[PDB]
Swiss-Prot record, chain A:
Belongs to the herpesviridae glycoprotein B family. Homotrimer; disulfide-linked. Interacts with host receptor MYH9/NMMHC-IIA. Interacts with host receptor MYH10/NMMHC-IIB. Interacts with the host coreceptor PILRA. Binds to heparan sulfate proteoglycans. Interacts with gH/gL heterodimer. Interacts with gD. Glycans are attached at residue 19. It comes from Human herpesvirus 1 (strain F) (HHV-1). The cytoplasmic tail is phosphorylated by the viral kinase US3. Phosphorylation may be linked to a down-regulation of gB expression on cell surface. It is found in: Virion membrane; Host cell membrane; Host endosome membrane; Host Golgi apparatus membrane. This is Envelope glycoprotein B. Envelope glycoprotein that forms spikes at the surface of virion envelope and binds to the host cell entry receptors MYH9/NMMHC-IIA and MYH10/NMMHC-IIB, promoting the virus entry into host cells. Essential for the initial attachment to heparan sulfate moieties of the host cell surface proteoglycans. Involved in fusion of viral and cellular membranes leading to virus entry into the host cell: following initial binding to its host cell entry receptors, membrane fusion is mediated by the fusion machinery composed at least of gB and the heterodimer gH/gL. The gene is gB.
Amino acid sequence: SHQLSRADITTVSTFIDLNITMLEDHEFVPLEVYTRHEIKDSGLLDYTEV
Amino acid sequence: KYNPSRVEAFHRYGTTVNCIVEEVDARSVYPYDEFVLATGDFVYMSPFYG
């Protein structure tokens, strides 16, 4: 009768989709609630400076 | 510094008054009822008293 392209026929999935997505790279920046200097400055007086 | 002129075998007192004006950092912590100066001198009074 005639030839057919494969995309011309409806395709049903025999496969089970498992969609695993990689845990993306993440960068942890240097984060501190207080820096060393802050804690040093938190003192009302510094004996060295005084 | 003013020191007394020489006289023989006498105790002499000499006064020197050096007026000083110094700009300092002053700091206060909660409850801000006192603050210090850079000279380590405490001021027992709220910065905000007015």
